Amino acid sequence: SLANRIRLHIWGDYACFTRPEMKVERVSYDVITPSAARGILSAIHWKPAINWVIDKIYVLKPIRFESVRRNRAATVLKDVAYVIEAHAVMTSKAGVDENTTKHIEMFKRRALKGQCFQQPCMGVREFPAHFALIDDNDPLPLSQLSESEFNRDLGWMLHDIDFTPHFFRAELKNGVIDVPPFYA
Numbered sequence: 509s510l511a512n513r514i515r516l517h518i519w520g521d522y523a524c525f526t527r528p529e530m531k532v533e534r535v536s537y538d539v540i541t542p543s544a545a546r547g548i549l550s551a552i553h554w555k556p557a558i559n560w561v562i563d564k565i566y567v568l569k570p571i572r573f574e575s576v577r578r579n580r581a582a583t584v585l586k587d588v589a590y591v592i593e594a595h596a597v598m599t600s601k602a603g604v605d606e607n608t609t610k611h612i613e614m615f616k617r618r619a620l621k622g623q624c625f626q627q628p629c630m631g632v633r634e635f636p637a638h639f640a641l642i643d644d645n646d647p648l649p650l651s652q653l654s655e656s657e658f659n660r661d662l663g664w665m666l667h668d669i670d671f672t673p674h675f676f677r678a679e680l681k682n683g684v685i686d687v688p689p690f691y692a
Contacts, residue, residue, distance in 0.1 A: 512595045512608045513563075513624040514615055516648060517641035518548060519589035522574075523630035523637075524582055526689050528666065528673065533534065534582035538571050538660075539678070542687045545592045545667040548628040548637050557602040566591035588630065592646055616641055638642040651683040658683050 518540075525537040525544050542562040549560040567587040575581050596615075598609040617626065619641040628637040642648065651658065662678035668690055680684055 509642070512612060514549070514592075514594050514612065516549065516552075516577050516592045516594075516619060516650070517589070517640045517642050518592060518628070518630075518637045519568075519639075520550045520630045520635055521530050521587060522576070523585040523588045524635060525585075525631040526662070533580075534578070534584075536573070536583060536585050537665055538585075538618035538662050539567050539665075539680070539685065540590055540592075540631070541666045542587075542676075543666055543691075544631050546640070546668065549592065549594055549615070551626045551628040552618050552624045553611065553612065554620070554625075557599060558608065559599055559608055560594050561593060561597055561690070562594050562687045564591075564627075565655065565687065566593070566648065566651070567680060567683055567685065570657055580630075582684055583628075584635070589649065591642060608665060613672045616643065626671075662690050686689045 523536060523540065524534060525541050527535050528535050545562045545565060546560045569587055572586045574581050574586045575583050597607060597609050597610065598606060599661040619639065628639060629635055630637045659682065663673045665678040667674045667676040674690065676688055
């Protein structure tokens with residue numbers, strides 16, 4: 509539904525969504541994972557009553573990498589921006605009659621102020637994620653993606669972990685990655 513839906517514009521000069529299979533040195537995935545996106549949303553607003561579910565990731569800027577020094581080196585994304593489209597689900601630990609409305613409204617209110625509970629980051633603590641709510645009557649940023657980077661098979665990527673990793677087939681279709689339901 510439109511009532512249970514948020515859009516958050518995020519950007520940063522650097523990002524590192526670490527690929528789990530590359531163990532020698534830290535190497536980022538090509539785009540933000542659902543896992544990292546959900547972290548970013550939860551940093552703005554979270555309570556045990558709810559879980560944020562990622563629906564779409566809009567990729568706005570060309571995929572580019574730089575090797576940078578770790579305080580050792582890591583290969584990280586440079587100059588990223590996304591839109592995260594998500595909704596809330598109630599957990600088994602929610603109030604008997606509780607709904608998503610107050611949580612959606614609190615998320616948006618916090619986000620509009622540029623406020624956050626803990627600073628969101630782009631995959632690793634050293635890279636902060638700047639953010640802006642895309643409220644209902646604001647437009648989506650335009651993609652700056654190459655006609656030829658608009659559609660890309662990103663391959664198997666971490667969807668999320670149960671603290672046990674679960675992967676999904678990430679496909680960029682006209683600048684957007686649709687994220688399937690986490691559970692089987």
